[PDB]
Write an enzyme that holds these catalytic residues in place. Sequence first.
Site, PDB file in Angstrom:
ATOM      1  N   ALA A  22       0.826  -1.201   0.000  1.00 48.67           N
ATOM      2  CA  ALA A  22       0.000   0.000   0.000  1.00 48.67           C
ATOM      3  C   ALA A  22       0.862   1.253   0.000  1.00 48.67           C
ATOM      4  O   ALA A  22       0.550   2.234  -0.689  1.00 48.67           O
ATOM      5  CB  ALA A  22      -0.936  -0.006   1.206  1.00 48.67           C
ATOM      6  N   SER A  78       1.010   0.925   5.463  1.00 46.76           N
ATOM      7  CA  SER A  78      -0.281   0.442   5.926  1.00 46.76           C
ATOM      8  C   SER A  78      -0.144  -0.216   7.291  1.00 46.76           C
ATOM      9  O   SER A  78       0.791  -0.984   7.534  1.00 46.76           O
ATOM     10  CB  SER A  78      -0.876  -0.554   4.931  1.00 46.76           C
ATOM     11  OG  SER A  78      -0.459  -1.877   5.223  1.00 46.76           O
ATOM     12  N   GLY A 122      -0.776  -4.221   6.918  1.00 43.35           N
ATOM     13  CA  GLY A 122       0.250  -5.043   6.301  1.00 43.35           C
ATOM     14  C   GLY A 122       1.373  -5.365   7.270  1.00 43.35           C
ATOM     15  O   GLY A 122       1.843  -4.505   8.017  1.00 43.35           O
ATOM     16  N   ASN A 140      -9.267   4.009   5.448  1.00 46.90           N
ATOM     17  CA  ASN A 140      -9.616   3.662   4.078  1.00 46.90           C
ATOM     18  C   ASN A 140     -11.107   3.443   3.887  1.00 46.90           C
ATOM     19  O   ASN A 140     -11.582   3.512   2.750  1.00 46.90           O
ATOM     20  CB  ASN A 140      -8.844   2.424   3.643  1.00 46.90           C
ATOM     21  CG  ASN A 140      -7.364   2.674   3.582  1.00 46.90           C
ATOM     22  OD1 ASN A 140      -6.842   3.507   4.321  1.00 46.90           O
ATOM     23  ND2 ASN A 140      -6.675   1.970   2.693  1.00 46.90           N
ATOM     24  N   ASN A 200      -6.302   5.260  -4.152  1.00 42.39           N
ATOM     25  CA  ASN A 200      -4.980   5.864  -4.111  1.00 42.39           C
ATOM     26  C   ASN A 200      -4.940   7.194  -4.841  1.00 42.39           C
ATOM     27  O   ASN A 200      -4.170   8.074  -4.457  1.00 42.39           O
ATOM     28  CB  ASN A 200      -3.954   4.903  -4.694  1.00 42.39           C
ATOM     29  CG  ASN A 200      -3.706   3.720  -3.796  1.00 42.39           C
ATOM     30  OD1 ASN A 200      -4.604   3.271  -3.085  1.00 42.39           O
ATOM     31  ND2 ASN A 200      -2.485   3.213  -3.812  1.00 42.39           N
ATOM     32  N   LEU A 226       7.504  21.024   8.215  1.00 45.81           N
ATOM     33  CA  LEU A 226       7.483  19.879   9.121  1.00 45.81           C
ATOM     34  C   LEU A 226       7.703  20.321  10.563  1.00 45.81           C
ATOM     35  O   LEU A 226       6.991  19.883  11.477  1.00 45.81           O
ATOM     36  CB  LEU A 226       8.541  18.864   8.694  1.00 45.81           C
ATOM     37  CG  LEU A 226       8.667  18.701   7.179  1.00 45.81           C
ATOM     38  CD1 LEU A 226       9.857  17.831   6.830  1.00 45.81           C
ATOM     39  CD2 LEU A 226       7.386  18.121   6.600  1.00 45.81           C
ATOM     40  N   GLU A 236       7.045  23.361  11.525  1.00 43.16           N
ATOM     41  CA  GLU A 236       5.793  24.063  11.779  1.00 43.16           C
ATOM     42  C   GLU A 236       4.631  23.093  11.941  1.00 43.16           C
ATOM     43  O   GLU A 236       3.697  23.375  12.699  1.00 43.16           O
ATOM     44  CB  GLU A 236       5.505  25.055  10.655  1.00 43.16           C
ATOM     45  CG  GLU A 236       6.648  26.015  10.368  1.00 43.16           C
ATOM     46  CD  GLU A 236       6.171  27.324   9.774  1.00 43.16           C
ATOM     47  OE1 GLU A 236       5.026  27.729  10.070  1.00 43.16           O
ATOM     48  OE2 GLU A 236       6.937  27.947   9.012  1.00 43.16           O
TER      49      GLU A 236
END
EC number: 3.6.5.-
Lengths: 430, 430
Positions: free
Chosen positions: A12, A132, A135, A198, A220, A244, A246
Amino acid sequence: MRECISIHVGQAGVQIGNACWELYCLEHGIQPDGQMPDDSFNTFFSETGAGKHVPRAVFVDLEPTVIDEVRTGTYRQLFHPEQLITGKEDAANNYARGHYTIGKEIIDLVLDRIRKLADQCTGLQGFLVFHSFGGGTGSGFTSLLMERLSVDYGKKSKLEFSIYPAPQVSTAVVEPYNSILTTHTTLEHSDCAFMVDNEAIYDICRRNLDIERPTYTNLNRLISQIVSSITASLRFDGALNVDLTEFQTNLVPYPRIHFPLATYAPVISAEKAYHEQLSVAEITNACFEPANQMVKCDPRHGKYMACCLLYRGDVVPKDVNAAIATIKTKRSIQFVDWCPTGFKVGINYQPPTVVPGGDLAKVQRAVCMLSNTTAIAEAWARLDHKFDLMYAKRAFVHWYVGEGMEEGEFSEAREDMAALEKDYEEVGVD
Amino acid sequence: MREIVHIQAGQCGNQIGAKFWEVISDEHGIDPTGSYHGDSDLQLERINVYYNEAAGNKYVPRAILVDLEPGTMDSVRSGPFGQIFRPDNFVFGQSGAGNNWAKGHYTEGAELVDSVLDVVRKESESCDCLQGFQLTHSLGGGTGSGMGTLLISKIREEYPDRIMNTFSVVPSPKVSDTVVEPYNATLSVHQLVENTDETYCIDNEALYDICFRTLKLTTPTYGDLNHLVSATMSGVTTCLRFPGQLNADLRKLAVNMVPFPRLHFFMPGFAPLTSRGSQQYRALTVPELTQQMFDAKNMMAACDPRHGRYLTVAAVFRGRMSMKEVDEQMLNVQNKNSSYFVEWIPNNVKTAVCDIPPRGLKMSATFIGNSTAIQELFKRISEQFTAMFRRKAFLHWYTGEGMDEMEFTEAESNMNDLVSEYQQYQDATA
Ligand SMILES: Nc1nc2c(ncn2[C@@H]2O[C@H](COP(=O)(O)OP(=O)(O)OP(=O)(O)O)[C@@H](O)[C@H]2O)c(=O)[nH]1
Ligand SMILES: Nc1nc2c(ncn2[C@@H]2O[C@H](COP(=O)(O)OP(=O)(O)O)[C@@H](O)[C@H]2O)c(=O)[nH]1
């Protein structure tokens, strides 16, 4: 200068990574072979001496199928072969197999490749991880990689576009085990993560995109559109940009609570593009509806720390202020007394870029809203309720035990999640 | 986790494996000479899981044939595809065991078990990333059961890290070659549960019943049962022979299906049933078959799931799918029979969809289930063994080959322990 690295692990993870990189290169006019027909693309891309631009990401998994699909896909000439890491034996829906037994043979090469990519980065800003929860590879390998990177770098930000499994799309019954274990392992090691259910994208595609049966492709594509809307601030410039650092600053009450909830608007299918395009007031009024978040939660129960906005397309700031003033009068929005307001506003004048042949329709303007709230607690509540139902009888435990695990890990992860939800109500009470 | 090797033993096992290879080659478009003769690229994508490339473009099954009686092996090349199997696989004996387990285990099993291990090794380091080993063999017959026990023991002590599947032919009192079958049957099932992790219980009782009442065959010969055996046991491998996000490998099969290390037995089912030469079936709709899965009359294990509770459920659909209504059928089945599913394992009823249909049929749906209701078969064999063993009869042949009745006692105690595990897991609450 201001480099940012993207990490894609698991089936995924690599699927949504391919989708998001396709959308990224399309948005910046980058050809599928990387040629040029804002100058912020250098944050997410590396310029080869020939002029070709290759994304500064990596494709990692313990399975060779999807990697081979990428190696023969549209952008096979885009990525170099070295960042497309290929395994032989898959984790097979097991956190333990993807963490201890099999991940060890590949993590060394993975970190060597990450260092190789970082060698071309001067002002590295952080790490983006796509994986994911369900997974086995994308949970165990993700957790161990998170630990290793935090050991290597530490203070540098490390994002995570986590995928929340849903029963309609779920492929294994051990998924709550893997999600619990990976989130307990990376909770200390991750400064900010994105928790997309999802089932939300699935039912949005069923209803808003009028898809009879959503597939991985449409799921996706929508996920990549939302991730692009999120990362536009790093990939463009704005009046109040969010980075990031911030991201951590404006969306973290405590390091434990780092799971912001996102909403993106609008969602119009291509078959209904002729309809009048939604206005800024319209999208703001439709943003907080329970059919637009990332998880199947009701924000009415929760209380927002801060409400972060990112605007795309031709949007006038005055009407943004008017819409914010109208929304603040609503009884739905509630802020903790410790956090008065954090209403960061970001405007990206670039119109959104639609994927060719995509179900969604092109719109002149769009907005994505970020806000963490205690309403997010219900996702962990249902998830750890499933985990408790699992653990009341020690189902499937032997599969973990045979791969360097014991029930102590299960117990400590469950109590860690109990402490996390405890923090949820504790910050949610004035 | 990339390839599978096949082993078959016993005249029943050899015949059913040969028919399996017939079916697999026919659906994958493999001619008797090994060259591709299909009409689509779906078959060739995963042809490597059950075949090896040869000179030019010949495809050969990875099947090692073993049998102690020359009649079975003469017969196995007497039929179709008797030449595709390489002569190296054919490592055989001549004495014949004749409904005895220990005698063929020790007095005559040693001088060919070395050769079979040598050939399976040659296959193994010839192979790259094999998933594991799946064995088809008879249980009541002493020859095949003893050979299977030898193979499972040697391969597990040699390859413990590989998920090693097997297929079981449970003896039937109605169609029984001899009467001393339950001795070897109990010994072999003890070895199977104590040594393997993936087994399908295909009892000849259910096959005889379904071929009698439903196929209207008054005296169904072994070929009549073998037809349905081949159909369903290709159906189980459908998820392992075509692309799909469900049940990619044997290890994933185990992780999804088996919840407990001891209890790893399977209760295979498949609908719609098809007789020999009966092609009057219309386009069967999904609702009738998805309500027909609950039936025990189309079950290839002599048990009734209504007497037990499903632990984990697997099913694959083949044909043209408007699989939105298939998901609707899932919803209705769950909401109507949640009482027949363990509450402490949510979302255990998952299915995939395949597009290649079986031969002559445009609609099919295999039904693989793991439920405590399979304990009826073990109760049957237990009561048979006790009622025919408390006289301490027929033990002379075994005791003359080193068998000691303490082995019988420990085997029966262990299998009663399995029955107790069934009973305690069946009544578990939520
Ligand atoms: N967001 C998203 N999730 C997916 C997609 N496909 C499958 N999943 C989910 O991802 C979970 C399984 O994880 P995987 O995609 O298999 O990734 P993994 O960690 O490598 O697991 P393995 O392939 O078994 O090794 C399941 O819950 C799937 O429902 C997808 O296209 N997008
Ligand atoms: N379905 C099926 N069952 C068989 C066949 N041959 C034997 N059996 C059953 O399996 C048992 C006999 O096992 P057997 O084939 O003799 O094993 P062997 O001693 O290794 O050859 C009896 O209960 C038979 O009814 C067959 O060709 N098909």
